[PDB]
Amino acid sequence: VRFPNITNLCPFGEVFNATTFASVYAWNRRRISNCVADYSVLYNTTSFSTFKCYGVSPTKLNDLCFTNVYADSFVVRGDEVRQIAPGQTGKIADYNYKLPDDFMGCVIAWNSISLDAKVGGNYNYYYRLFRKSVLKPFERDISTQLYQAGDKPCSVEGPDCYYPLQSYYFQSTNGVGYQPYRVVVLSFELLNAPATVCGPKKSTHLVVN
């Protein structure tokens, strides 16, 4: 005899406990559906440096229902975690990853260093320095196309043609501001269409059909 759960626990340990993350200019997006989501495990990890749930309730997030659940993951410097927030202007937010000013959901980050700054680092993360326009909310641009300062012929890396992408150099000796920080953003959303994920207690509230 076994206890059957028609909706398995949602894949939340996959995104957070993942071995490798992505550079901010190429952030990774995930859909969580056809499952039951316990957000208590997200609270129970006290190692999380920042748990900034704009909009929805922090600890009563578990006691809710949702339709569109998107999880975005990237790693940025500690002093740039503030730029991953509603209505904050900065090099990361303007050109790499922008949250809506009306955004509802949460931003989660932790210290990293242990894995993504290993002695003789095996990875290399990156970030975008220049762009013509500020990114609209939830927009991505992986363009490798060169940027011009004045009216410039940008076919060669030159005095005024600057390569748009730049590299993060994470070392143990770096300070907290210049140390890597792993950020996962949960983009909860509500749709008038039938719901997809609610929570453990609310298995029949809206998640099931």
Binding site: L129, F130, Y147, A149, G150, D151, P159, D160, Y162, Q166, Y169, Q171, T173, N174, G175, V176, G177, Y178, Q179
Partner: protein, 596 residues
Amino acid sequence: STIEEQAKTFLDKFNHEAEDLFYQSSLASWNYNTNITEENVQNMNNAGDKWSAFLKEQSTLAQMYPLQEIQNLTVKLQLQALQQNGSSVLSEDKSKRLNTILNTMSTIYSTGKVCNPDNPQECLLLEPGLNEIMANSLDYNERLWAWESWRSEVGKQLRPLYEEYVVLKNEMARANHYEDYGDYWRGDYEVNGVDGYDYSRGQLIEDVEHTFEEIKPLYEHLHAYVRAKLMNAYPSYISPIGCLPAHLLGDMWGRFWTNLYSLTVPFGQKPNIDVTDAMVDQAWDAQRIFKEAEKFFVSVGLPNMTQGFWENSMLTDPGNVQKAVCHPTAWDLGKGDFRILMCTKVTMDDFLTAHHEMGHIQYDMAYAAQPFLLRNGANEGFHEAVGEIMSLSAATPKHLKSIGLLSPDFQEDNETEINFLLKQALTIVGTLPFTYMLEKWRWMVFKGEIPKDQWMKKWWEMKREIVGVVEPVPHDETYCDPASLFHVSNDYSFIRYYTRTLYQFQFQEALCQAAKHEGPLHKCDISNSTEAGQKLFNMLRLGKSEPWTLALENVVGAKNMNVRPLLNYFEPLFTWLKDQNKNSFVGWSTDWSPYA
């Protein structure tokens, strides 16, 4: 688009692409200064060359953007520094010899060992030994040997290298729109863009002499009081009318008269303001000294030391296993990395200098928000003055009583304040003539006023007249005694230390007005005053962005160095010294020599 905006994105590329290159050089330089190895000298020099190469290439690209078009003044400063041609004006023949000489002089000074005339295998090095001899010995011959041997066996070898150092460095400065190498250093104090807050290269040279003229009377009575009290310590060797023999002063060069406090202490029976004995007897550690200095900055509201400071810094001699550069150094490596390298010994001198060097870091941490090319103090004196503000508050007997290095029932007195003020005057007032003469010699040598044949004559001609210190042994032009000091041999501006002292009391006067005070400028412990700390934070956060004259004006209320606060701090000592010299001669005779 505008070239100004075109240059803004050029600097944005520069700032983001330069930090790692500068960080690698700083890491390698740290790994050599903490560990002397031929492997590290190559790695450090390679990273410096790559950093220098990045400077050369990005400088040439910066020449295209014209400064006259830019109207955002903070942008103008960043472009102006990057556009400057430094050693780039020199040819490969000139640059190599200039760097080969510069490293050679440093290695001679670092590896300088004087062997005992008997038993030549026994050699005494300036840092571990031969300074204890010059700071703890009362034997006239032992001090004479260490003073003469260093300036002969080490100094003479630096004479040929310094002559070519001057001519090559002058060619560098003269090429880059300067009169001499002295003008290259003198430009650090220049503002030329803002009305009312402007400055010039020569305004420093005239303000220094005007301000030093009002320090001479205080120095004279300090000189006479020290002279009389040194006369008892070294009988039959000092003239009651003549100058002071150089080797009988506090240190190897006469820079600081601090070690003379034991001989010249006014009231011995009063509890010692020199808490060096108290620290050792209470088992104070190197860690406690830097931890207590940390709590001082914390109390005024400034931040804790970063964990990279406590994890990565070197606060003790690593041992005979590995060599190290034990000159007190504050490191702003970048990337949020702040470290202090120091050969901390349990003495009051290292207790105060720990406050001084942590003051460097607090300034360094504050201007970290400013861009890379504005990541520096307003001028050289500002950085060295910030540390001295703390050591001025930390040296007060009340603060010493606070930390436990003085008895909990310590009762203040007229006598103790003279004991405290004299020790502070030996360190602060004593060095002012030494610094004024040393830079005036170098400034004139760079200008060529002093010929190569009259080098050593002028060095001791001015030392007698300005500083009141005489040569114990006659010296030829073969000797090169000015280069026997670390700062001259390692190509650092030295007038920063004179300007430092005048700023120090000017800041403290304002900081001790914000911190509601009652009495004089001494007994000014800004400890536990957040208002005093936040008044400094605003100055520290600006960095090089705002002009130094404006930065000084907002803090203290003046656009220039004012010698008045310094004299008020020592006014109780000046009046006491005059009475204590009623039956002593005040002044020195320029024609008395011990050898004569």
